[PDB]
Every structure is written in structure tokens, then in C-alpha cells.
Amino acid sequence: MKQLTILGSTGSIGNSTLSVVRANPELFKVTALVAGRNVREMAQQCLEFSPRYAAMSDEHSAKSLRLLLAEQGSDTEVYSGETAACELAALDDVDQVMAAIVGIAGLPSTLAAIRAGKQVLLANKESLITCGKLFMDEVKRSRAQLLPIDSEHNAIFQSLPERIQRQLGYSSLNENGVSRIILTGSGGPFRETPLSQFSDVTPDQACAGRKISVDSATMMNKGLEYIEARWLFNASAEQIEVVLHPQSVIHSMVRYHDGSILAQMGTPDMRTPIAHAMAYPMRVSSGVAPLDFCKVGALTFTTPDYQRYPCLKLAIDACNAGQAATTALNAANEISVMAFLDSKIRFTDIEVINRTVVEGLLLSEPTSVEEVLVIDRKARDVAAQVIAKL
Amino acid sequence: SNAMKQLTILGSTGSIGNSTLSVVRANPELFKVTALVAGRNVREMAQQCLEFSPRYAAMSDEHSAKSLRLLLAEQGSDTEVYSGETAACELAALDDVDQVMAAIVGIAGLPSTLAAIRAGKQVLLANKESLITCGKLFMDEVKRSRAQLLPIDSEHNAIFQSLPERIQRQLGYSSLNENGVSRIILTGSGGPFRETPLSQFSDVTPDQARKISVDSATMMNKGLEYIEARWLFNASAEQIEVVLHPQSVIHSMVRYHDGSILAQMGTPDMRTPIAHAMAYPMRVSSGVAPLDFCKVGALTFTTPDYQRYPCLKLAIDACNAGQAATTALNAANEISVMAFLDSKIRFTDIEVINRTVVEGLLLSEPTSVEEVLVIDRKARDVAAQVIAK
Ligand SMILES: [Mg+2]
Numbered sequence: 001m002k003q004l005t006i007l008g009s010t011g012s013i014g015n016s017t018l019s020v021v022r023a024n025p026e027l028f029k030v031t032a033l034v035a036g037r038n039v040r041e042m043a044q045q046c047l048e049f050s051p052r053y054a055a056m057s058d059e060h061s062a063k064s065l066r067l068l069l070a071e072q073g074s075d076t077e078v079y080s081g082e083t084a085a086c087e088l089a090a091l092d093d094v095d096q097v098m099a100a101i102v103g104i105a106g107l108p109s110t111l112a113a114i115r116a117g118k119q120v121l122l123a124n125k126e127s128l129i130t131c132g133k134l135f136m137d138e139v140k141r142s143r144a145q146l147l148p149i150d151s152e153h154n155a156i157f158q159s160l161p162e163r164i165q166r167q168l169g170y171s172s173l174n175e176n177g178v179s180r181i182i183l184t185g186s187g188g189p190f191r192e193t194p195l196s197q198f199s200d201v202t203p204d205q206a207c208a209g210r211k212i213s214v215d216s217a218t219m220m221n222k223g224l225e226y227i228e229a230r231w232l233f234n235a236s237a238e239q240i241e242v243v244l245h246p247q248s249v250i251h252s253m254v255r256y257h258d259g260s261i262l263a264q265m266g267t268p269d270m271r272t273p274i275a276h277a278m279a280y281p282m283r284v285s286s287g288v289a290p291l292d293f294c295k296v297g298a299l300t301f302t303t304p305d306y307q308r309y310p311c312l313k314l315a316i317d318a319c320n321a322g323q324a325a326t327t328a329l330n331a332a333n334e335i336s337v338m339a340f341l342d343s344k345i346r347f348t349d350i351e352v353i354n355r356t357v358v359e360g361l362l363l364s365e366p367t368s369v370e371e372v373l374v375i376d377r378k379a380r381d382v383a384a385q386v387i388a389k390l
Numbered sequence: 391s392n393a394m395k396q397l398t399i400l401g402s403t404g405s406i407g408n409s410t411l412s413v414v415r416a417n418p419e420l421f422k423v424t425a426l427v428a429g430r431n432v433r434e435m436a437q438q439c440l441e442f443s444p445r446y447a448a449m450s451d452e453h454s455a456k457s458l459r460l461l462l463a464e465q466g467s468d469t470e471v472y473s474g475e476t477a478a479c480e481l482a483a484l485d486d487v488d489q490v491m492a493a494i495v496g497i498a499g500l501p502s503t504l505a506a507i508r509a510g511k512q513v514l515l516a517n518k519e520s521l522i523t524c525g526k527l528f529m530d531e532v533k534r535s536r537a538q539l540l541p542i543d544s545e546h547n548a549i550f551q552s553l554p555e556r557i558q559r560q561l562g563y564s565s566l567n568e569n570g571v572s573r574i575i576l577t578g579s580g581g582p583f584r585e586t587p588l589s590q591f592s593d594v595t596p597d598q599a600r601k602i603s604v605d606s607a608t609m610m611n612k613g614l615e616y617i618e619a620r621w622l623f624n625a626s627a628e629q630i631e632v633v634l635h636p637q638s639v640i641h642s643m644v645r646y647h648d649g650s651i652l653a654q655m656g657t658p659d660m661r662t663p664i665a666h667a668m669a670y671p672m673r674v675s676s677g678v679a680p681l682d683f684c685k686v687g688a689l690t691f692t693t694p695d696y697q698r699y700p701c702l703k704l705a706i707d708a709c710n711a712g713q714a715a716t717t718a719l720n721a722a723n724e725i726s727v728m729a730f731l732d733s734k735i736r737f738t739d740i741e742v743i744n745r746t747v748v749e750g751l752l753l754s755e756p757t758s759v760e761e762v763l764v765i766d767r768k769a770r771d772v773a774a775q776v777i778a779k
Pocket residue numbers: 150151152225
């Protein structure tokens with residue numbers, strides 16, 4: 001019987017997590033929920049799952065929630081603010097914390113769950129993109145157990161030995177028999193587009209949410225998954241490669257010393273890796289029909305060409321350059337993408353802008369959230385500057 | 391290493407034995423050969439003894455053993471030489487040996503294999519007949535001494551690697567269901583006649599498909615793997631499926647309760663599963679070229695056509711009928727295949743011969759190697775008669 005705190009409960013990952021709980025009531029108890037300002041949805045979740053605690057992002061939201069709950073005679077205690085969220089992430093009786101507050105704003109609560117020794121289900125990506133060293137050092141310090149919920153990281157996790165799975169990101173891949181992690185992805189809608197057509201890609205062509213569309217066409221999404229993966233799995237540059245797999249049947253793979261490659265497959269569904277993570281080392285049922293091998297297309301593979309995906313190369317370079325570089329790249333990219341979606345720059349200008357920012361860098365390695373914030377803001381400025389000027 | 395693993399290799403001069411030595415040769419600080427067992431191949435045994443200096447070697451008879459000792463003497467070896475079944479069984483059970491490569495083929499391989507298991511060893515299983523013929527006996531003995539079994543064959547190895555750790559550690563006597571396992575997926579290529587029109591089957595010559603070739607041409611190989619797989623993994627009929635995968639990049643896979651699948655992939659290099667099994671639970675390098683994903687083509691999947699592959703269905707039937715039936719099936723098939731190879735019967739006869747023998751016998755479930763052997767002879771003989779018609 002697991003006690004849960006869910007950080008970022010009203011969003012998509014929040015609801016999927018709650019969905020698993022709803023299907024497995026004897027396995028999972030919700031102790032605490034933390035959300036932003038969506039009072040209507042948070043009330044509905046508190047009324048269904050009876051948490052002991054709830055926290056909103058601000059006092060005004062908390063007060064409206066307190067009213068809604070009190071009308072139903074609920075027992076739930078309501079708080080607000082970042083400190084409250086951190087406290088709920090560290091409660092004694094809690095076994096499992098879903099860290100799904102998005103953006104850099106998600107760092108402090110994530111880090112509080114990690115600092116409390118909890119099983120942490122990692123749904124926040126900036127933690128590792130921007131201050132991986134601080135996060136993974138805190139992991140080793142507290143022995144916290146990380147479990148990735150995004151499909152690729154979750155497939156690498158399942159393709160690894162228990163020994164590494166239970167010592168996530170602070171055990172040696174090599175000593176434990178791992179030769180290299182194989183991070184896979186589809187290559188986006190432009191995997192076969194003639195290179196000459198890239199300069200003409202429009203927002204509507206990349207877009208048929210919107211920013212994630214663009215990140216998956218540039219492979220920035222894969223680049224970010226790459227950097228988080230070097231931190232999550234304690235891998236060097238030589239211990240990871242990226243392979244294209246158009247059909248998205250394999251989710252990712254792991255090569256071992258003797259030649260063996262273990263791979264995880266399954267029909268694409270958000271809930272599956274969440275449910276794997278939450279139930280681990282048990283398994284519980286899915287909604288979706290099991291993958292049928294007579295109905296998958298043939299499975300194919302390639303190597304990503306840097307001419308076609310220069311952002312990928314850029315994210316690797318940024319990775320090897322350090323955390324200030326990846327913080328900056330991440331921030332720069334957000335600006336680039338909106339600028340593209342706002343028809344201000346060409347599709348092909350994204351890498352250029354991003355590279356300019358990354359290579360213009362000369363700041364120290366960040367060692368806290370505060371220093372990450374500084375770099376993030378500087379990088380948005382320079383990126384915006386670099387945009388305006390062409 | 392101060393935790394070197396000591397090895398007994400049974401059937402040291404076969405191809406599995408030599409590949410096992412290759413992994414030793416690549417990791418000389420991790421593995422030490424303590425004993426080698428072979429049959430009649432005196433020259434080969436000697437080259438291996440002179441390379442790895444085992445404490446002991448056995449041959450299958452005294453003529454073999456005496457001449458081996460002569461060459462070992464000429465070259466100044468400290469290897470003590472023995473012969474006979476008893477010797478092999480003792481070599482399989484030395485106190486200081488951690489693991490036994492059980493690679494003696496045929497029913498001849500059962501005594502030594504059983505001796506390793508009973509000594510609670512890490513047993514690297516490379517003898518089909520052990521589980522096809524007396525599964526119940528071998529598995530009861532595994533549970534009873536807690537021996538750790540490690541499938542060496544491609545597909546069984548792939549399945550082992552794709553299963554939860556808790557299953558791996560209690561291999562053969564743990565619950566698939568309780569560990570989130572839903573289904574074992576046994577894959578195979580379909581062999582050379584996967585796409586031959588059925589009406590040409592009757593005309594297939596021994597060439598177009600060596601017992602080995604034929605076995606995978608009929609997919610008797612896979613049905614055999616299927617029976618062994620039921621014992622090895624403690625799977626019911628409903629917990630195992632067969633899938634055709636022509637390119638054989640995926641070596642086999644496991645479905646879990648959440649619908650997710652784990653597969654092991656690699657290249658055809660037999661050192662992969664051997665090094666896996668030998669290093670277990672650690673891993674080692676052994677010179678294997680990492681699968682290159684630019685060079686694999688499209689991977690494709692399909693269900694086996696029992697019309698094209700009747701043997702498979704027969705193997706499943708035999709399995710459901712019990713150990714006498716599967717023992718009979720194994721034996722019938724040897725006689726059957728040789729009869730196809732010797733230009734005495736249609737390719738297309740092999741199954742009917744096999745099913746006829748399997749279906750014509752009044753047997754009792756064997757409960758010892760000896761009774762296994764009795765069903766084997768009986769069944770070989772019946773097969774001989776069926777052929778005369
Ligand atoms: Mg992803």
C-alpha cells in the first residue's frame with residue numbers, strides 16, 4: 001500500500017497518475033495534492049481521492065478551494081506557496097512523490113522530494129537539463145529512488161539491470177555490465193524531406209501542442225531527452241547513442257558488454273510508463289489493447305544525420321560543454337521556437353539562433369535554482385536580441 | 391580476480407564447448423577451467439588441456455583416456471585423466487566448481503547434466519533432451535537443490551534476459567503470473583521454406599534444407615524449444631506464443647501485464663548467450679561485434695502457419711499429452727529426419743511418421759533417466775516400422 005504526493009496534479013501527467021490510482025485503490029492512497037490555480041479541477045480531485053493535504057500556487061486559489069471543500073464537509077487541509085509544496089513533497093508517511101510541476105518552477109519541490117529519500121517519479125525535465133549535477137548529487141546523498149515516467153527514459157530504465165534500476169544515476173553503468181544506452185525516436189515529420197525544403201518549412205507544416213511539435217521536428221526534444229539521460233543514468237558521451245526508429249514500436253534499448261541488447265516495446269500510451277513507475281517492481285493492467293505484431297508495420301532504423309538534425313548535435317555539444325550551456329540552450333530554444341511560430345524567423349534559423357546563444361556563453365556552472373534562473377533569463381534576452389537583428 | 395569462477399565443461403570438444411573456451415580465453419582473469427569432459431576426440435581434448443590446464447579431464451572410454459594421457463605426458467601437463475559416465479558426473483559436482491557448461495548432446499547427456507543440478511551448481515544448459523524428455527524430474531531437482539539454470543540456446547537465453555530478476559533467480563519454480571509476466575514470446579525464422587508454395591513441399595530434397603537444417607525447415611526445432619520453454623520457465627500453454635520473425639534480429643521476448651514487451655536482440659554470435667550465462671549476474675566482453683542498426687533491414691513479424699509447419703502443432707500436442715509423448719516425439723523425429731536425409735521418405739512424410747508414432751503408443755509417464763531411455767528405444771523402433779510402410 002503506497003502513500004502518494006502528486007505535484008502538478010491538474011495537468012496531463014497529474015490526471016494520468018490519478019487515473020492509475022483510480023484503477024488500483026488497494027495499491028495507492030493519495031496523501032497530498034499540489035496544483036497551480038485550477039480551483040475547479042483541484043476540488044474535484046480532492047473530493048474523489050480524499051487527500052489529507054492540498055496546496056495551490058497562491059493564497060487566493062487556496063481560499064476558494066478551502067471554500068469548495070468545506071461546503072462538502074471534506075477533511076482535506078489546504079495550503080499555498082512554494083514552501084508548502086516542498087513540505088508536502090517531504091512528508092514522513094509518504095512513500096512516493098510524482099514530481100510533475102513543469103518548468104524551472106518545478107525544481108524546488110522536486111528537489112525537496114529528492115532530499116527526503118522518497119521514491120521520486122520524475123516528470124519535470126528542467127531539473128536535469130539545468131542542474132543535473134545538483135540533483136544527482138542530492139540523489140546519491142539521500143539514496144532517493146528516481147523513476148523516469150517519460151516513455152524513452154522509462155524504456156531505458158526497464159532495459160536495465162535491477163542493480164542499476166535500484167541505484168538510479170549513482171551506480172556505474174560500466175561496472176554493472178552496461179556498454180551503451182540507445183535512445184530512440186521517430187525523427188519527426190521531416191525525416192524524409194529533401195534538405196533543400198527545410199528553409200521553407202512553415203509553422204502550419206510543422207504543426208499538423210504547438211511548441212512540442214516544433215521540438216520534435218528539430219529533434220530538440222531528443223536533444224533534451226539526451227541531456228537528461230546522461231544525468232539520469234550516469235552516462236558519459238560514449239555510453240549513449242541516438243538511433244532513429246520511425247514506427248515508435250521500440251521505445252529505447254540498452255547494449256550490454258557481451259553483445260546483448262535489451263529493448264522495451266509497447267503500444268504508445270502515456271499511462272503505461274507512469275503505471276510502470278508507480279507500481280514498480282509490480283505491474284498493473286493497461287487500458288490499451290496489447291501490441292499486436294501482425295499489425296505493426298515493418299520496423300526500421302537509422303542513424304540521425306546532423307545536417308538534417310543540427311539541434312541534436314548542438315544539444316550533445318552543449319551537454320559536453322556543461323550545465324550553463326544546456327540551461328542556455330533550453331531557454332534559447334524556447335524563444336527560437338515561438339519566434340518561428342510567430343513567423344519571425346525561418347525553420348532553419350532555430351539551430352542558428354540556438355548555437356549563437358550556446359557559443360556566446362561565458363557564465364559559471366550553476367549550482368542552485370537561483371543561478372539557473374539567472375542564466376535562463378540572460379539566454380532569453382540574448383536569444384530575443386539575436387532574433388530582432390536579422 | 392580473487393573471485394574467479396571455476397568451470398567444468400561437459401562436451402568440451404563440440405562447438406558450444408569451444409565457444410565457451412573462447413569466452414574464457416577473452417577473460418582469463420575471470421574464469422578458470424577446472425575440468426573438461428569430452429568423448430573420443432583425443433587430439434582436440436589435448437589442445438584444450440594444453441591451453442587451459444584444467445585439474446581434470448575425462449574421455450568417454452579408457453582407450454581414449456589412455457592415449458590422451460600419453461600426449462598430455464609428452465608435453466608436461468599436470469592434468470589428471472579419467473573416463474566413463476561416473477567420472478563426468480563427479481567432474482560436474484566438484485565442490486570448488488561454480489558452474490557447469492552442460493553441453494553433452496543426446497540422452498547420453500542426461501546423467502552429467504542431472505549430476506550438476508543436484509550439486510546445486512550454476513548450470514549452463516546446452517542439452518535439449520534434458521527438458522524435452524524428463525522435464526518434471528529435472529525441474530523437481532532444480533527446485534530441490536536450488537540450482538541456478540542458465541539457458542544457453544539463442545531463444546531461451548533471450549527469454550531469460552527479458553524476464554524479471556526474481557524469476558531468473560528461481561528459474562523453473564517461480565510464478566510468472568505473480569511477477570507481472572503475462573506471456574513468453576518464442577520467435578523463430580520460419581526457415582528456408584517460409585515462402586515456398588505448399589504444393590512443392592512433397593518434392594523438397596535433403597539439399598534445399600544437417601539434422602539441424604531439417605529441424606528448422608520443419609520447425610521441429612521450435613516445437614522442441616517450445617516444450618523446453620514450458621519447463622524452463624514454468625509456463626502453461628496459455629503463457630507461451632510462437633511468432634515468426636524472419637530476420638532473427640530479435641531473439642525472443644516477454645509480454646508483461648501492462649502490455650509492455652521486453653526483447654533481447656543481437657547478432658548470431660553464440661558467444662553472446664554463452665558470455666551472458668557465464669558472467670551471470672555480471673556481464674563480460676567477448677569480442678562480439680555489436681549489432682549495427684544501419685545494417686539490419688526491416689524487421690517483420692508473423693504467426694506460424696501449422697499447415698506449412700505441422701510439426702509445431704504436433705510438438706504442442708505432445709507437450710499437452712505429457713512427457714512420454716514428448717519423449718516419443720523427440721525419438722521419432724530423429725529416425726524420421728535421418729530417413730528423409732537418406733532419400734527414403736518425402737520431406738512431407740516427417741510429420742506423419744512423427745504423429746503416428748506419438749499417437750500409437752501406450753506409455754507410462756517416465757520418472758527416471760532409465761525409463762526415459764526405454765520410451766526412447768521403443769519409439770525409435772516403432773518409427774522404423776512405420777517407415778517400412
Ligand atoms: Mg519522450
